[PDB]
Amino acid sequence: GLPWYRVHTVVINDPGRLISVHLMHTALVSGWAGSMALFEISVFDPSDPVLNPMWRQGMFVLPFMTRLGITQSWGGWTISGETATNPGIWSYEGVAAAHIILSGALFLASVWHWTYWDLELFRDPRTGKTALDLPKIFGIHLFLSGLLCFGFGAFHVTGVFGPGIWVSDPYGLTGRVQPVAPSWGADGFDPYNPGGIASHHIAAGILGVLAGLFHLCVRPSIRLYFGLSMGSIETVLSSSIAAVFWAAFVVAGTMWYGSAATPIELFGPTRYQWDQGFFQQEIQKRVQASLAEGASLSDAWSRIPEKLAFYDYIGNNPAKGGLFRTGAMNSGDGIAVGWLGHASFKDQEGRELFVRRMPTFFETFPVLLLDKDGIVRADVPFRKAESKYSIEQVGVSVTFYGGELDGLTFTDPATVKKYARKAQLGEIFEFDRSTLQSDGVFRSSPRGWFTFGHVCFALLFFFGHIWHGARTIFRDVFAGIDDDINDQVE
Amino acid sequence: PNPNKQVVELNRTSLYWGLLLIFVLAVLFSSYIFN
């Protein structure tokens, strides 16, 4: 009989079992969605949203509920850091239950369509055999798609009837779910504009309705019926697999690069924000905003939010991870407890020093202390036999400003080397390697894990597009070639 | 009375490829899974 890899092709001939077998897959996907949301709520720690947020804890599908308005829980807590007085029915646990209740309803529907497979709807008139009108079937489902797209865009995102989406500031500090207005100019194609998301789904929803009305009425061309093999249920599979790896490269691309549909308070910062000095420049923009108005150092560094200094850290970079360094980001370096200050380095000639930060490539990186003009003055040398840039001889002291070590100075050449090696990792933080028994080496955020799956899926679905496009064009020669096929040579 | 009823077959050479494949992947990857 069939091989092991060909068993599911018993469904290619009868449409009733095709309903039943997509219903079982749909029951498993929403059955995963509720079960993963129940698992994430049962392990989420909502205590510190400032310094232990959801992307720090390994929450994968909880930033997708929170992206579309679900901010409250049936345990009292919220995401923004307050108590929910009325959680409503659309909590995290209400939605985790609404997918399990839907999973059993789709389960029972699949059992129905498996037994009652021989419906009269699936047999076309006056030939009596099982047939599907795939140009009109597409016209139905494209019409429903643009109707939901326009419904999600005009009502859910815009806040006309639904709640809205997540919108934050540029620096990930002040972020809520609030309604957006659509933006119809050139600004709507800036993907860091949330208004272009609402303006997308209205315009693409209206066009998807109008295109759906086309494919409901206008039958295809005969020359384009044969050339795209429209009479097969597999030429829609090949083109749909082509549609979903295209989408999965775009989806994983905007997750990795960052977009308004991927906030950093939900998914963490991007690797291009550590590389391009995104938060470091703003932290310096706010210190220099205070030293110019007239203030002390330790009174200016206290005015920086502890959440902003946590984005400026290599351990929250999604590209400082490993493929088998599994779990939460808190499992790597610990749960962040408090910002420990801003390490400022001075040598014995009264000159400031600046630690060259670890680039994103480097697993290990030598610590270097550069001056204002960019010249190395101190380091922790590898050879200490005849050194000329050692911290011991240059006389590097370290003072902190703000944080838990405010106004405290360290001149001990063992202590200074410890904080110089923490200052190349970013801002200085205090962790606990005892709460989760942390390994000591970093992990990747859900922004990095989502991107890893959805490019590995988008690449394996390129091959499935190649396989299933080949099985439609070469449907007649699937079991082998003809015996007299030697006419193709000279 | 579905006319679309098929059977799956798996001969012993395909058993020996399949059992080998999931043990060699377990020889390979579990060094990383146990870390």
């Binding site: 092991w4 599994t326 | 059977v7 799956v8 077959e9 798996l10 001969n11 012993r12 395909s14 058993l15 399949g18 059992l19 999931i22 043990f23 992947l25 377990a26 579990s30 899974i33 146990f34 870390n35």
Partner: peptide, 30 residues
């Protein structure tokens, strides 16, 4: 030595091992 990897190894063995044994002993009796 973790709870994950010791039983993920056992599930990656036995769930595909026995699946192939279900299909072989089905076939070898035909």
């Amino acid at each position: 030595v973790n709870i994950y990897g010791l039983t993920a190894t056992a599930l990656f063995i036995i769930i595909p091992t026995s699946f192939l044994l279900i299909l072989y002993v089905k076939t070898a009796s035909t």
